[PDB]
């Protein structure tokens, strides 16, 4: 919501309160999403200032407060900062921003991250260039200096982050993305490589000194229809946990496929169907394994731009005898959303 606009500086204070419940059989420990209350809320601001006729500065911040925690010693469990960056922009020359922002490979993966609750399982947080990450300098240019309509490209530098966890760490790296859009059609490709920290190498699962992630997407968005397909391959980048031996690390190789189909009714109801399968290769001790595997049947009713309600059923295809202990039960999310 735009709350200030004076002297060429507008500030959008936006937020949302999502009352959410997951339904799975039993305690939900063997499920895809879990079971119980999942209510949460978001706050953030997007600022944009007109420095002059061509130059434009902007910044953004977003936070996630959980509502499914008690007021006791576990009040902060799950609270986090999603985004935090600032940048500048020149007419068609490009935009440079630094901070915690999205990795370039999300440009491709975003094509299939349209579901009401789930989806986009490949855009892991703090996972090199596929999801929200910290300290990424990104140069992005639109229309190649204003010469081609629909042609955009991006190049990104990922700084070193040696954190307390092997999952949340990363080394130095570079990545890029290119995209072309014509008459509702869209094609995207993105690639990224990076070093690995000693802590990441010391983990039992995964081998190598560099991590690699790339994905490609194709979309059609028009006439109330949205179709999208993503294929991507990762090397030493997807996080994995063997629940039988309680070990963590990364998959030496993964093949990820995402499919999404959606229609938009005039009065609001938006049916959605999706498929998602991620499969790992060269897993130490297991070989080939299924990481994600499900079909999705869901519907979202837009009351208006501020309120919505959705139901998302995930029919899980993961095998009940999966050699990594991946959940095999279904999960149904029910949500009621206010947002501004």
């Amino acid at each position: 919501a735009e709350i200030y606009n004076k002297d060429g500086n507008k500030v959008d204070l936006y937020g949302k309160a999502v009352g959410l419940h997951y339904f799975s059989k039993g305690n939900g420990e063997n499920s895809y999403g879990g079971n119980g209350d999942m209510t949460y809320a978001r706050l953030g601001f997007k600022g944009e200032t007109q420095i002059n006729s061509d130059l434009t500065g902007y910044g953004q911040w977003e936070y996630n407060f959980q509502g499914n925690n008690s007021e006791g010693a576990d009040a902060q469990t799950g609270n986090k900062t999603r985004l935090a960056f600032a940048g500048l922009k020149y007419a068609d020359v490009g935009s440079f921003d630094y901070g915690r922002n999205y990795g370039v490979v999300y440009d491709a993966l975003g094509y299939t991250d349209m579901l009401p609750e789930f989806g986009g399982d490949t855009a892991y947080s703090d996972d090199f260039f596929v999801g929200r990450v910290g300290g990424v300098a990104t140069y992005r240019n639109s229309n190649f200096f204003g010469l081609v309509d629909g042609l955009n490209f991006a190049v990104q530098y990922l700084g070193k982050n040696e954190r307390d966890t092997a999952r949340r760490s990363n080394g130095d790296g570079v990545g890029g993305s290119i995209s072309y859009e014509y008459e509702g059609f869209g094609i995207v490709g993105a690639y990224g490589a990076a070093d690995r920290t000693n802590l990441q190498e010391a983990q039992p699962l995964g081998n190598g000194k560099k991590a690699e992630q790339w994905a490609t997407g194709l979309k059609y968005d028009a006439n109330n229809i949205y179709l999208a397909a993503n294929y991507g391959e990762t090397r030493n980048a997807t996080p994995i946990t063997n629940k039988f031996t309680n070990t963590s690390g990364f998959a030496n190789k993964t093949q990820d496929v995402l499919l999404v189909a959606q229609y938009q009714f005039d009065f609001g109801l938006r049916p959605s169907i999706a498929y998602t399968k991620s499969k790992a290769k060269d897993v130490e001790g297991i070989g080939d394994v299924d990481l994600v595997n499900y079909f999705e049947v869901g519907a979202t009713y837009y009351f208006n731009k501020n309120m919505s309600t959705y139901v998302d059923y995930i029919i899980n295809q993961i095998d009940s005898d999966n050699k990594l202990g991946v959940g095999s039960d279904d999960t149904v999310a029910v949500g009621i959303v206010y947002q501004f």
Binding site: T56, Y58, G87, K89, G94, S95, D97, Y102, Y106, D107, L109, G110, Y111, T112, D113, M114, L115, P116, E117, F118, G119, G120, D121, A123, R140, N141, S142, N152, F153, A154, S177, S179, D312
Partner: peptide, 13 residues
């Protein structure tokens, strides 16, 4: 983690 991929595109819009 659904619905976040919409928009984005490339560059600051």
């Amino acid at each position: 983690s659904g619905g976040d991929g919409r928009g984005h595109n490339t560059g600051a819009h």
